[PDB]
Amino acid sequence: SIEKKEEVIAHNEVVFRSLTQGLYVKEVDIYSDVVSYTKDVDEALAMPNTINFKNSRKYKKLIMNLDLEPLNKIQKVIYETHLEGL
Amino acid sequence: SIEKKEEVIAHNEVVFRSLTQGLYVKEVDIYSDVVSYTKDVDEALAMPNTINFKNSRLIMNLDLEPLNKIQKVIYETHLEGL
Amino acid sequence: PIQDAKPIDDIVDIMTYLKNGKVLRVKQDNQGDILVRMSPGKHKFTEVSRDLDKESFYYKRHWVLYNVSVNSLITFDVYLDEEYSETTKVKYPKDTIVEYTREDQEKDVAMIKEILTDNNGNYFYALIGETMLFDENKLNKVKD
Amino acid sequence: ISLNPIQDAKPIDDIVDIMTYLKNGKVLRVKQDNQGDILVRMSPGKHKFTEVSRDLDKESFYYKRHWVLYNVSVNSLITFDVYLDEEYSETTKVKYPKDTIVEYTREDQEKDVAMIKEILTDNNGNYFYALIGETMLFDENKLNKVKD
Amino acid sequence: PIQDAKPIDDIVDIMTYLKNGKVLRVKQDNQGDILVRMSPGKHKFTEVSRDLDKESFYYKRHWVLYNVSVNSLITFDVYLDEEYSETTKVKYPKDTIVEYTREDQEKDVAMIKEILTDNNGNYFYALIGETMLFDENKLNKVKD
Amino acid sequence: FINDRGIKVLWEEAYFCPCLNPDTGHPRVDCPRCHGKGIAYLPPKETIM
């Protein structure tokens, strides 16, 4: 018996994976081309994607790159209340 | 999909509800008999759901439905592919 | 052949598509491409957006009012946005002025109107006022 | 002994038909709330563009309508009720037009509400009104229009 | 039937009630209801109050002067305040425009003037220029 | 007279950008609507002034 359910979003950012290598980007150069890779979601390069930051410019040359696979990362907390009788 | 998840139980407690009105207990008297009732499920008077507490005083009133209450908070992350 | 472009000829069709609510894409000369739209709800009015890229989880189109003129619509090229292909990878686009030698080895100027290709990417061009095809090498871009 | 019914000018409600008439080249007539009543035409010949004029009358041999380019707006057409020139005219500026709801005095000294469904004028210019729920025709002085 | 409304027809009666000092209630169009009164004491002048609710231990009416015009009195609806019922719970109030089908299944517009009810709350309406009753379902509200 | 003496000019109205941080009450450094200024603008309108 679920009584109350609330869903909350902690973070919302975009992470880019290479189709071939399967790694995540961690760093880029002056031209925004990749300098490094990392196989860790927590350390990967991130573009903020909360509502105020949509339609960015900093990573246009990155997004257009076909080898890269953008991924929308979302972190959530949900609260579930229960009643179990006597 | 789910990349990482964990469930932790913040609280386990016993809550008191009137059998007639259905309003939960908000405040009580000197001997834990009710003086105020409230409709709120969560603001209701609550106590830990542990055996020792029961031996330390459900006991006091008859228009009394001693209910158990549990809280689940869940931390999860997703990687939603394109 | 390639069907990257499907221009609309009649404005009546454009208005009909606008009544259907589908987004349009209108070209501009030496200026940024634009998208056009009819507003939903009780009040119907034209809206515009300078955002070209596709709607996404990281990219949302921004719409605002404008008093668009039919003169731009009737004159400029118009397309259905979703059906549009960003580019056709050829040396000289359509409506591009080139200099070519006619069949009698006399040189004339012309503009290009054709899209044909084999399965390897070799392209051919047919000139306005002409019938046969001309290669990428044969044509020469006419400087402004 | 009266003139045949006189028709009211129908405002065009849908944009699609208005553009269709405009593409054919049939003249439109637009009323602007702020500034004026104007005609709209798409240019003749191959050099296509929209034109606007304020010469509000039939093209008499001694009355040449003059046109100037203007960037007409879509929203202007939508918000402002528009007519076809061939209908909108001084031929009828009836006080209560067709489809208007009015309060009219009945024989039983009761004021009932009814809609005008047909309009015609006698030779003297008095407008005869046909009303829903009534057989005979009614006169302008007898009627009352309730607004809001 | 219900007697929730007892409108005054003659202004002479209104003045007579005002001389008696009883409070009035005057309706307004798209505006707040108002109460009117004659001042006591040596000087007699009209007073008004925007407070509608009944006088109480927690609620006291506030009165002020005003140069009221007879034109509002003679035109607008007027009632004795204490005798007034706040509302009559029906779908379409009196003087509300509705569309109805006449006996020959031809549709005409009308405004409502009737208050009749059984003891269960089922209501019936008689239209201006009409005799027989019309149900809540039969009538259709005419949009402004 | 105004059209005779004036000069042709573009006119755009002003409105506070949504990007304003709700807590500090101050704007994002760079967003398309406003490039660091705390105020956005509407599409241009043509006018003589």
Ligand SMILES: [Zn+2]
């Ligand atoms: Zn901003």
